[PDB]
Design a protein around this ligand. Structure first.
Ligand SMILES: Cc1cc2nc3c(=O)[nH]c(=O)nc-3n(C[C@H](O)[C@H](O)[C@H](O)COP(=O)(O)O)c2cc1C
Ligand SMILES: Cc1cc2nc3c(=O)[nH]c(=O)nc-3n(C[C@H](O)[C@H](O)[C@H](O)COP(=O)(O)O)c2cc1C
Lengths: 376, 376
């Protein structure tokens, strides 16, 4: 099983290639990591396995979900330390994902009910909904477009949060630059309508992610920084006119940061669009994933370092990805929600528990969070 | 059991609400209905049960699957009559679905080597494939956007095929106006990029289906016409910027044909979207199930007549649909493939056979077609 051949990610000797994808679960009540998160990550940790946390706030303006953890206060750092310690005691490696949602927020999540910040004043359209604190769905509002100085302050929020993660004992951080959140609002030409030095050309659109990555690399070292992007996913109205060109331009910049810094990043992590093959249509099961596969393989080929693929992977697709050389590591989201022992189940080719979307984002510390059963 | 409360569909006294959905199965060798189809439909026919045939060709250029029946030649009419007779001997009602695939074709199904016809010049994208005669998957070619003047000839093909279906003894026809095929290529503004009178406004985009339905109603009467649409489906790149406005525009023109005709159509048949896109994203699924139930209920409330729902129904969901007033009739596809006596099994709550997708579209007159077992 190629998913269980060891992989050397920088200094880390991983025993297998099954990664816990970062997943927002909303159990970090009032943005404080809770004991429940310790139980959850400990259930899923394995010796030599790599875990990535849920998206974690870098500042008071960075959230667009309820009860997501922060790492911008010392109180948050102290609670994160307890979670990191129980994961390390199982021999796992864990990175903290640093997440700013940008325009994907709501007055209810902002200090003093201020407008969310973005590259643009354009709102996400009513194709999309936000989860409100009472469990209902709300409408994204108009964001405020930030200028150059405020951009530098957001970059410093990333830097300070990266330092805090290291203080908490994390092995590194992952920059959430995907899925139409703040960084992707600068990258995507369907969102970034700026005319200043952060808008227009590919170079300009890539400036913000380059500045964020450079700031955290200069603070904690390139080896402790992973980067996540999704050029071909248009979640939250995040389309680009040319996704492969945008992805290659980002890869370009990461390779250049690595040459200048003299060190490789921990990894590039890319989520791919994944089209469900509807079984009830005439041709839904005749589909081909070749074009999207070629896009992913071209990003991997272009990037000088470790590549993590994500988005709809199964045991079989993960095995194929590693066997074909298409990725070094494979991250799993939904199946890891419902299978605390996903690594072992994939090793044994055991049945996998179904997942219940209804409890993905509820607040109970057990129900739908830590009560999915282990192999019996 | 609400699914076994009788239903009056026009002059048809149906004894239960379980409908055989139209399903392409590719047993109609060289486009001529075969004795195997007779056995297959006879197996599934019940006293007072409603059956809809597989999509059936309206012209030599209208197919996109191998060995699908036509009803545009008198030979085809003669073979269909034999099938209709065995279904009627069982006391069932049967409608012939008239099917033109538009741009979802291939040169192998184009006898004069012409490009497939459509509203648009844009081909179906690379992630969709066509079933080839040898079982492999082929690539969809570039279609030709038909001129304004050619539309009336395709409408005429529907009219002549509807007359032929009646000559064969069918109780009615169903217009396949769904799933990204020819009529849906005019409906969906994600496909229809015309600038003439059949493009642009919802009114313009609805003209083609209105003219098709009017032609067949004027040929055989409204009571013998059902109409199938899918305003929200992911199939062959058929998307729309406002499915509800599109669906309501279609319903309002159907209601108007009924008002001016002085008779109601046999029914409106709507595919349930079963939206599962963006499951791998943070927010992609928020409020989508609610939007989907809103869409279907808004259409059924607006349509003045019988409403058939289809797509992903089980025994339980079919009961709930009829119980809540969401549908008058529920059509089943995949479970009817593998359970010839699905009606009886649903009545008794018996175990349901699994289906084998590998033999959905093969040519064997028995294997995977009529050799699924009845209750013992
Ligand atoms: C409930 C849920 C929460 C998620 N939260 C995050 C997140 O906080 N940060 C992120 O980068 N991706 C997030 N994702 C995307 C996942 O990291 C991952 O890319 C996706 O789940 C992989 O597809 P799979 O579920 O088929 O394995 C989330 C996905 C789900 C379903
Ligand atoms: C093998 C197969 C062939 C189908 N052929 C047609 C068709 O020719 N015309 C049509 O309108 N729908 C067709 N459909 C869609 C079905 O009519 C129906 O909507 C679907 O099967 C219902 O969902 P279910 O299988 O979960 O019951 C087909 C579906 C399948 C699985």
């Amino acid at each position: 099983n190629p998913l269980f051949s060891p992989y050397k990610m920088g200094k880390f000797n991983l025993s297998h290639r099954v990664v816990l994808a970062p997943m927002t679960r909303c159990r970090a009540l009032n943005n404080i990591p809770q004991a429940a998160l310790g139980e959850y990550y400990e259930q899923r940790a394995t010796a030599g396995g790599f875990l990535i946390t849920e998206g974690t706030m870098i500042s008071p303006t960075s959230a667009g979900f309820p009860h997501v953890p922060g790492i911008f206060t010392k109180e948050q750092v102290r609670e994160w330390k307890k979670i990191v310690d129980v994961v390390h005691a199982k021999g796992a490696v864990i990175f903290c994902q640093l997440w700013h949602v940008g325009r994907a927020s709501h007055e209810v999540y902002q200090p003093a009910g201020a407008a969310p910040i973005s590259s643009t004043e354009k709102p996400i359209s009513n194709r999309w909904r936000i989860l409100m604190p009472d469990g209902t769905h709300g409408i994204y509002p108009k964001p405020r477009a930030i200028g150059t100085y405020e951009i530098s302050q957001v970059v410093e929020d990333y830097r300070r949060s990266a330092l805090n993660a290291i203080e908490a004992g994390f092995d590194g951080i992952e920059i959430h630059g995907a899925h139409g959140y703040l960084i992707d609002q600068f990258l995507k030409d369907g969102i970034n309508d700026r005319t200043d030095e952060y808008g227009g050309s590919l170079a300009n659109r890539c400036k913000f992610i380059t500045q964020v990555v450079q700031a955290v690399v200069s603070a904690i070292g390139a080896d402790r920084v992973g980067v996540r992007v999704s050029p071909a996913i248009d979640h939250l109205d995040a389309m680009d006119s040319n996704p492969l060109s945008l992805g290659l331009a980002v890869v370009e910049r990461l390779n250049k940061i690595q040459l200048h810094s003299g060190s490789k990043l921990a990894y590039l992590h890319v989520t791919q669009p994944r089209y469900v093959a509807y079984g009830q249509t005439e041709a839904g099961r005749l589909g081909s994933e070749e074009e999207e596969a070629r896009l992913m393989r071209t990003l991997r080929n272009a990037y000088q370092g470790t590549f993590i693929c994500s988005g709809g992977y199964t045991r079989e697709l993960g095995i194929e990805a590693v066997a074909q050389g298409d990725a070094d590591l494979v991250s799993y989201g939904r199946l890891f929600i419902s299978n605390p022992d996903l690594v072992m189940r994939i090793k044994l080719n055991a049945p996998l528990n179904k997942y219940n979307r209804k409890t993905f984002y509820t607040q109970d510390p057990v129900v739908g969070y830590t009560d999915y059963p282990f192999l019996q």
